[PDB]
Design a protein around this nucleic acid. Structure first.
Lengths: 261, 261
DNA sequence: TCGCGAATTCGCG
DNA sequence: TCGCGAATTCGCG
């Protein structure tokens, strides 16, 4: 906690702040540590923007739109920095998804399944939707050398450890973390090419195969491994980390703004 | 229709063959036009395979698995070719998704909405799930210079033209193709970087921004623009086209197998 | 067995 | 208004 970061995180903790509201708290923290640079927070990017960024890499890209005022709303919002050339650069994007009511059911006594008999519920695939926004922002940032997209997972479908929950009638039901009846965590790992979860993957890797070279944009996938609620303090700390990492990678475009002024 | 391709497509038409069954019909067609090369059809790729292909590009990739026997099943299956080095190369992957019951409701008389009153139903986002399999196969093929992934869309949520449907009580309800109450087509266009839909995008583009260079893997997104059922003949023709295009891009690795033998 | 997949209705600004 | 988003239950081999 470099100075105020400890003061800020406890404010998050004190209020149980959701993901969008923490991303705002980050904007304030950042502008309280970089008072020369200019930060803003959005709750939306409209497809036209993305398309126009796509077009500027190659003129054959970004030539589709079917709904004119179409947009994407990451429920954590976007935080940006104005660089030396008046352009706005994305420093943080974040999302928070929930899947798996199982721990609630078996924390109580409600049997599930078609015939009201099962302790566990066969996990679904809705979480795969999270791959779209990742592609949009990855396309939006196809000229950047960083990818400050952070996902925050919660629920019985993203366990990293074996947890046992006791129902009102004394019985300890047990969730096995690697059971393909509950765990959907593998449905997400395409997003960071099988690199580590709960990790800051913000700086883009450059790999190859032949006369090739290719940049990979990898989402930072964070999960609460015991099905518990996320602690808004650590959620803040993580987002602060990704965004400061983003500012590192942006350094060359930010020199004049924070050194000359 | 180069010879038998006309005979094959009419067989598809005659039987109203679904997507997986057409992909099989393609395997036969291909092996009937390239009798020296060896083709196979799968209905599954397990995560371990993907991970091992990922690892072979860069040793830091592909190091995650939480459910051991986890897999992806494209409902159109995968078609592959054995190259000169005994390795199996993917020549076709295909998926078929349906969203938007609207044309059925207003082809009949069933009013929808919470209070049984609406002619149209606010479209949902389930179709965004289709972005996961795309990432898996794109990662699987991160060493290839082609991406034979084809999506086939159907329903009132993927209209390209304005269509009017008449309900039993004489009334003509009208679907506007660019209404963001029905059209979800924009939720997919992240998958081919805003390049044209209903197009064969199989050969990978290579773009850049600075001292960079990057390969783009773009899904071929085909839609039935009038909410009608797909004609299994044209569905076959399209898949034949993508896969022959794939064989073009594979040419260098296939020479010995079809020329020496 | 275990594990992948369907796509849906409605709420919210 | 229009348009984006929640994630769920159960079926199938």
């Amino acid at each position: 906690s470099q100075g105020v970061i400890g003061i800020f995180g406890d404010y998050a903790k004190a209020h149980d702040l959701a993901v969008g509201e923490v991303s705002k708290l980050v904007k304030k923290a950042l502008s309280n540590e970089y008072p020369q640079l200019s930060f803003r927070y959005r709750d939306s990017i409209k497809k036209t923007e993305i398309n126009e960024a796509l077009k500027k890499i190659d003129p054959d890209l970004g030539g589709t739109l079917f709904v004119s005022n179409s947009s994407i709303k990451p429920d954590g919002g976007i935080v940006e920095v104005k660089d030396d050339y008046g352009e706005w650069r994305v420093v943080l994007v974040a999302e928070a998804k929930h899947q798996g009511k199982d721990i609630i059911n078996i924390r109580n006594g409600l049997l599930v399944g078609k015939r009201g008999d099962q302790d566990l519920m066969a996990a679904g695939n809705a979480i795969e939707r999270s791959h779209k926004n990742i592609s949009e922002i990855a396309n939006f940032m196809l000229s950047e050398s960083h990818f400050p997209y952070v996902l925050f997972l919660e629920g019985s479908n993203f366990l990293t450890e074996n947890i046992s929950i006791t129902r009102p009638d004394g019985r300890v039901v047990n969730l096995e973390y690697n059971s393909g009846i509950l765990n959907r965590l593998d449905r997400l790992t395409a997003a960071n090419y099988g690199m580590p979860i709960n990790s800051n993957l913000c700086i883009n890797k450059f790999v190859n195969h032949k006369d090739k070279s290719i940049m990979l944009q990898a989402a930072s996938i964070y999960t609460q491994g015991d099905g518990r609620e996320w602690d808004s303090k650590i959620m803040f700390e993580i987002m602060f980390d990704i965004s400061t990492t983003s500012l590192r990678v942006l350094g060359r475009d930010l020199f004049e703004q924070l050194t000359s002024k």
